[PDB]
Structure 1
Amino acid sequence: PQQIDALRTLIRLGSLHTPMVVRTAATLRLVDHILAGARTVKALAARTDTRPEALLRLIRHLVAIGLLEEDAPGEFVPTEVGELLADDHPAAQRAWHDLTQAVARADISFTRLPDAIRTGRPTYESIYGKPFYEDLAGRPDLRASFDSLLACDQDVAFDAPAAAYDWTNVRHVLDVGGGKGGFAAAIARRAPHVSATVLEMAGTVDTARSYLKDEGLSDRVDVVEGDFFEPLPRKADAIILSFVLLNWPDHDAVRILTRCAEALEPGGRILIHERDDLHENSFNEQFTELDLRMLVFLGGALRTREKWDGLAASAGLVVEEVRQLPSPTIPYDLSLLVLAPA
């Protein structure tokens, strides 16, 4: 029958149990326990305190989708794909799929995706009771998990964009929504003359200070607790917005950009570190995953190249330059947009 291939393709794409099986495996640390020697259902059930027959039924789907394989009778081992759920694999995919950590927990928001397409508004609060960052504020453990996930690739998060900008004429940097201070730290290492300030939320500021202290950068990078919708705590030659604006709908993104514009020294620049696909190039799974997460988590959005041109104008800014960043690790197209006063 001619449509069976198409049918199977649709059913697979539409299957909700398959990603939940992957995330359940991640959460139970199943692959770690297997690598440590528990290859049978009875051994793995003991290690995870799960019911043996129910665990077998989970394992059966993990084999069907190619994450595990039955090596000997009743003995299971990870495939090349399944091995990526080992806890210390550099892609950190176990943590990214762990239902007790911030992102896979937030992904439950997708169960109300129709509401988000109707309203353009996030569904996270309807599930967890508070909007995303307020929820993280009330759950320091989730805050910590979130901060660690985002920084899982330091070359992409911090080193590549720091290396792609000329800091020679920069004296002061303000990193707005700067997380644990990784970006500010990478700049400081490359540009010894720079002093930097990280503006962040409660909880994150302590992680940031502790990180910078560990790095021996406390004297060059300070951390300020604050709200980037209010006047910024000081002026700067370079103001960093690294994966900040995508958290926000257009009217909020403009407010943040305007606060940054108002804090620029003469000759200063605003640096945006984000995706910037041309619209015609944006129909890809990397763009849509992050963009749709921003919708249901936060009501934010990824902006295509043509939108960035528009957003800058509204904040009294102009796009001076868009620097296509190298991909030092995985092929993941990122840019550094450089904005100047209009």
Structure 2
Amino acid sequence: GTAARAAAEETVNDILQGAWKARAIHVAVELGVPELLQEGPRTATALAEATGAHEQTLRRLLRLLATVGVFDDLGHDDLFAQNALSAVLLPDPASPVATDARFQAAPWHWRAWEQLTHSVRTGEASFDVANGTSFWQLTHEDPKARELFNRAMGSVSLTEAGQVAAAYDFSGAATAVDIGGGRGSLMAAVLDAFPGLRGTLLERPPVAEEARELLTGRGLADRCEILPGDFFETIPDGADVYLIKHVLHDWDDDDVVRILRRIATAMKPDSRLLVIDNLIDERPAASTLFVDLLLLVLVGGAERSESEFAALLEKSGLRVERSLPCGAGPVRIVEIRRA
């Protein structure tokens, strides 16, 4: 009765305090604490001097983090040490969690969440009202913002890329086009896995240059054309396979139909389109739904079920051939042809 109510109150309070737990991690990565603990334990004093932090306050922060499992408090000599949890925060372009922590550390990321109520009232991004500009405009104009986002997306993509290349038989295709392909890890993985294939990566001009760097340094520049462009205006015509991964979930129904219709126009009767995205099924995991809420906040996007995609595909002159599993999580490969 009373004890049950008190337990519920404590459970909910832990949820509220969870916001501060996350922010403490953001500050630890922003300051570079985990990187400073790779060669044994260090004192709060020493960590404060190296990071430019206020000593007493960094000590409070580190005590708190250790209390919730991040870093170990050695309990003597003012020492703190790396542990299993703090270790996953080490900067690494291949780590989703490490890149995401640094992405989320940005004030404009946190501020979009400040205005979550706006998104819940509109179905639109809160990013604009919070930050005075859109997520796409910020990442277009601001190289630091672009870098934080592209790293966080890029780490996720590196993992998925190998999975896609292993889950779909591209052996029949001579040409592939990756629409909004980010830094190009998906195209790189598929090209590596299918030596006869050639590709084109289409991206926003600044991002396209980053993809050029990744693809060139991996020895793939002579097999992949880089196309700076806008997928609302341009889709290269007549390729065997088109790929679009974690793009459509950024866009509302109208904008998805715009994209799909332009893709449909570019497709040959024998062409295939692979929509590669998070699919909502009957019992989505909490994590899948958290990412759905992030899409809402940043760009007014949303995850969709296969039937929701199928409806939009129909309005675009396309139809689902089949859907294939792709590694762990909600990601699926939806193979699509012209109707």
TM-score under structure 1 normalisation?
Answer: 0.91
Distance in 2 (alpha carbons) for counterparts of 1:223 and 1:155: 19
CA deviation vs aligned residue, 1:105-143 (integer Å, no higher than 9, x gap) = 424311111110000110112232221111111012322
Distance in 2 (alpha carbons) for counterparts of 1:320 and 1:287: 24
The correspondence for 1:29, drawn from 29, 32, 43, is: 32
2:190 alignment partner in structure 1 = 187
**Structure 1 position 324 matched with structure 2 position 325:** yes
Q: Please list every run of 5 or more consecutive structure 1 residues that lacks an aligned counterpart in the other structure.
A: none
1:157 alignment partner in structure 2 = 160
The count of corresponding residues between Structure 1 and Structure 2 is 335
Could you tell me whether the CA contact under 8 Å between 1:107 and 1:293 is conserved in 2?
Answer: no
The correspondence for 1:115, drawn from 93, 113, 118, is: 118
Could you tell me whether the CA contact under 8 Å between 2:104 and 2:110 is conserved in 1?
Answer: no
The correspondence for 2:82, drawn from 75, 78, 91, is: 78
Is the partner of 1:230 in helix, strand or coil? coil
Is the partner of 1:197 in helix, strand or coil? strand
2:142 alignment partner in structure 1 = 139
Distance in 2 (alpha carbons) for counterparts of 1:157 and 1:114: 32
Residue type of the alignment partner of 1:10: V
Is the partner of 2:177 in helix, strand or coil? strand
1:308 alignment partner in structure 2 = 309
Residue type of the alignment partner of 2:313: A
Distance in 2 (alpha carbons) for counterparts of 1:177 and 1:76: 43
RMSD value over aligned CA atoms?
2.1
TM-score under structure 2 normalisation?
Answer: 0.92
Distance in 2 (alpha carbons) for counterparts of 1:78 and 1:8: 29
Distance in 2 (alpha carbons) for counterparts of 1:314 and 1:100: 36
1:258 alignment partner in structure 2 = 261
**Structure 1 position 338 matched with structure 2 position 335:** yes
Q: Compared with structure 1, are the counterparts of its residues 202 and 67 closer, same or farther at alpha carbon in structure 2 (3 Å cutoff)?
A: same
Could you tell me whether the CA contact under 8 Å between 2:72 and 2:82 is conserved in 1?
Answer: yes
Could you tell me whether the CA contact under 8 Å between 1:38 and 1:44 is conserved in 2?
Answer: no
Shift of 1:94: 3.1
Distance in 2 (alpha carbons) for counterparts of 1:268 and 1:186: 20
Distance in 1 (alpha carbons) for counterparts of 2:22 and 2:165: 35
**Structure 1 position 178 matched with structure 2 position 175:** no
2:289 alignment partner in structure 1 = 288
**Structure 1 position 126 matched with structure 2 position 129:** yes
Could you tell me whether the CA contact under 8 Å between 2:40 and 2:81 is conserved in 1?
Answer: no
Q: Compared with structure 1, are the counterparts of its residues 98 and 231 closer, same or farther at alpha carbon in structure 2 (3 Å cutoff)?
A: closer
Could you tell me whether the CA contact under 8 Å between 1:151 and 1:157 is conserved in 2?
Answer: no
Distance in 2 (alpha carbons) for counterparts of 1:304 and 1:246: 11
